[PDB]
Amino acid sequence: FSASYSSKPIQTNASAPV
């Protein structure tokens, strides 16, 4: 499995739902 939405201008396997 590898990173989704990779081309798009978007932020956010995050360590924590801060």
Partner 1 sequence: MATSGFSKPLHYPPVRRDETVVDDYFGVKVADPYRWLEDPNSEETKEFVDNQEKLANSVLEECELIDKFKQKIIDFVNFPRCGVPFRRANKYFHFYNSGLQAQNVFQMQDDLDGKPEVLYDPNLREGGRSGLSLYSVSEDAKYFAFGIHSGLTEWVTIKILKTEDRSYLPDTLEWVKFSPAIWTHDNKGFFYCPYPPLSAVNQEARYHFLGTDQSEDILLWRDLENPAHHLKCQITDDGKYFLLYILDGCDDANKVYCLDLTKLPNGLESFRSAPFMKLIDSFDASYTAIANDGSVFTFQTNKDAPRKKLVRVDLNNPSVWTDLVPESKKDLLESAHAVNENQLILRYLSDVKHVLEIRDLESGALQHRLPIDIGSVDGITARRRDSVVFFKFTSILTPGIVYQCDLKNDPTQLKIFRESVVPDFDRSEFEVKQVFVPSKDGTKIPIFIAARKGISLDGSHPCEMHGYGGFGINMMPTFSASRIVFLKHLGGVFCLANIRGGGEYGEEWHKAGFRDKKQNVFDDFISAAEYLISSGYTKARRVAIEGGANGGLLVAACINQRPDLFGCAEANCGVMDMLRFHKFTLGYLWTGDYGCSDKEEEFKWLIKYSPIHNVRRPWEQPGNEETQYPATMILTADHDDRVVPLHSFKLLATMQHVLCTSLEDSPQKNPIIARIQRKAAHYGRATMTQIAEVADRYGFMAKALEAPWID
Number of residues that bind partner 1 (CB under 8 A): 17
Task: State in angstroms the smallest separation of the CB of 4 from partner 1.
Answer: 9
Distance, in Å, from the CA atom of 3 to the CA atom of 13, rounded to the nearest integer, reads: 9
Distance, in Å, from the CA atom of 16 to the CA atom of 14, rounded to the nearest integer, reads: 6
Distance, in Å, from the CA atom of 13 to the CA atom of 15, rounded to the nearest integer, reads: 6
Task: State in angstroms the smallest separation of the CB of 17 from partner 1.
Answer: 5
Interaction residues for partner 1, span 1-18 (CB under 8 A): 1-3, 5-18
Q: Which residues bind partner 1 (CB under 8 A)?
A: 1-3, 5-18
